[PDB]
Automatic annotation (TrEMBL), chain A:
Assembly description: Homotrimer. Interacts with the capsid vertex protein; this interaction binds the peripentonal hexons to the neighboring penton base. Interacts with the hexon-linking protein; this interaction tethers the hexons surrounding the penton to those situated in the central plate of the facet. Interacts with the hexon-interlacing protein; this interaction lashes the hexons together. Interacts with host dyneins DYNC1LI1 and DYNC1I2; this interaction might be involved in intracellular microtubule-dependent transport of incoming viral capsid.
Misc. remarks from the entry: All late proteins expressed from the major late promoter are produced by alternative splicing and alternative polyadenylation of the same gene giving rise to non-overlapping ORFs. A leader sequence is present in the N-terminus of all these mRNAs and is recognized by the viral shutoff protein to provide expression although conventional translation via ribosome scanning from the cap has been shut off in the host cell.
Organism this protein belongs to: Human adenovirus 26
Cellular localisation: Host nucleus; Virion
Superkingdom to which the source organism belongs: Viruses
Induction, per UniProt: Expressed in the late phase of the viral replicative cycle.
Function per UniProt: Major capsid protein that self-associates to form 240 hexon trimers, each in the shape of a hexagon, building most of the pseudo T=25 capsid. Assembled into trimeric units with the help of the chaperone shutoff protein. Transported by pre-protein VI to the nucleus where it associates with other structural proteins to form an empty capsid. Might be involved, through its interaction with host dyneins, in the intracellular microtubule-dependent transport of incoming viral capsid to the nucleus.
Parent-protein residues present: 703 to 752 of 952
Name under which the protein is recorded: Hexon protein
Amino acid sequence: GSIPYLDGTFYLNHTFKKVSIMFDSSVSWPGNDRLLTPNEFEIKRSVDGE
Amino acid sequence: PTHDVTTDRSQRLTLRFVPVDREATTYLYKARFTLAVGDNRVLDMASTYF
Amino acid sequence: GTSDNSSEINLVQQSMPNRPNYIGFRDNFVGLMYYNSTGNMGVLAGQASQ
């Protein structure tokens, strides 16, 4: 069947939750306080969100 | 551009504001907030939403 | 026997006391207020900047 790797037919990017970036274990790259969540990127906050 | 486009200090990008006072009539809801545009930053009113 | 209606056999009846069971709050009230849970955290934001 179709190979998402090399023809651009991705369909599983809806199963990510949180992406965390750290430069040599320093403060996270996304910035100082650029995000509503304190120190990471939040996706698919599905379980519960106030 | 690199020189003077965006800050390097700590700043949020999205701010939530809880109502200072609220009035729930039988057919109304009167919520009153206090926008706080701190110094050295400008807010475009099109971004705000309830 | 099996039935509990009064009878000569049912006169023989030995009953140990119920097993003791204490109920009360936990120490230092643990578990009474949500802690270190991302679902419902709790805040101490300043009024102005929120």
